[PDB]
Design an enzyme around this catalytic site. Structure first.
Site, PDB file in Angstrom:
ATOM      1  N   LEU A  83      32.424  -5.758   5.536  1.00  0.00           N
ATOM      2  CA  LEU A  83      31.794  -4.463   5.787  1.00  0.00           C
ATOM      3  C   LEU A  83      32.138  -3.857   7.157  1.00  0.00           C
ATOM      4  O   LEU A  83      32.413  -2.663   7.254  1.00  0.00           O
ATOM      5  CB  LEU A  83      30.284  -4.697   5.590  1.00  0.00           C
ATOM      6  CG  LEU A  83      29.410  -3.441   5.456  1.00  0.00           C
ATOM      7  CD1 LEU A  83      28.149  -3.804   4.680  1.00  0.00           C
ATOM      8  CD2 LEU A  83      28.970  -2.856   6.791  1.00  0.00           C
ATOM      9  N   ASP A  84      32.230  -4.678   8.198  1.00  0.00           N
ATOM     10  CA  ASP A  84      32.515  -4.268   9.581  1.00  0.00           C
ATOM     11  C   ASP A  84      33.990  -4.464   9.999  1.00  0.00           C
ATOM     12  O   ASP A  84      34.324  -4.429  11.178  1.00  0.00           O
ATOM     13  CB  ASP A  84      31.552  -5.037  10.514  1.00  0.00           C
ATOM     14  CG  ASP A  84      30.954  -4.220  11.666  1.00  0.00           C
ATOM     15  OD1 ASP A  84      30.935  -2.973  11.603  1.00  0.00           O
ATOM     16  OD2 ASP A  84      30.460  -4.862  12.623  1.00  0.00           O
TER      17      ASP A  84
END
Lengths: 83, 57
Positions: free
Chosen positions: A59-60
């Site tokens: 996600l990051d």
């Protein structure tokens, strides 16, 4: 030359700002499902917490490519050399 | 499938009061049917009376 320097400040703001926006909405979605899963069964919490961090790495991923390039445009500058 | 909830019937409270549903006939002419049943009821009820527990019927 002032156009290249002024448009680098906007590029830095868009590159960090769109990452600050995506990471806060994306983890608030995932985090809510983690708290809901914890409420359904507190026995699986240690396992679910580890699974949440495994998705946190996907996600990051790209948001840090923009925070690194933006901090590389504020101190260094590949566009000034190009005139 | 749903461990988050446990209905009061599926969990035991260790306290001093018990209930019994007793099934018996309306008519007679039975060769010891009610007598042997009441004997077993009294046998088990006494265990609770002696343990200090109250009983509802």
């Amino acid at each position: 030359m002032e156009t290249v320097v002024g448009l680098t400040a906007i590029a830095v703001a868009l590159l960090i700002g769109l990452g600050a926006l995506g990471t806060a909405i994306g983890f608030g979605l995932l985090g809510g499902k983690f708290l809901e899963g914890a409420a359904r069964q507190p026995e699986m919490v240690p396992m679910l917490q580890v699974k949440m961090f495994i998705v946190a790495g996907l996600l990051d991923a790209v948001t840090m490519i923009g925070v690194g390039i933006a901090l590389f445009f504020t101190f260094a500058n590949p566009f000034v050399g190009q005139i | 499938a749903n461990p988050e909830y446990r209905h009061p019937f599926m969990v035991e409270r260790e306290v001093k009061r018990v209930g019994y549903i007793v099934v018996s006939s309306d008519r007679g002419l039975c060769g010891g049917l009610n007598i042997n049943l009441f004997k077993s009821l009294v046998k088990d009820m006494s265990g609770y009376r002696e343990q200090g527990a109250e009983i509802d019927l």
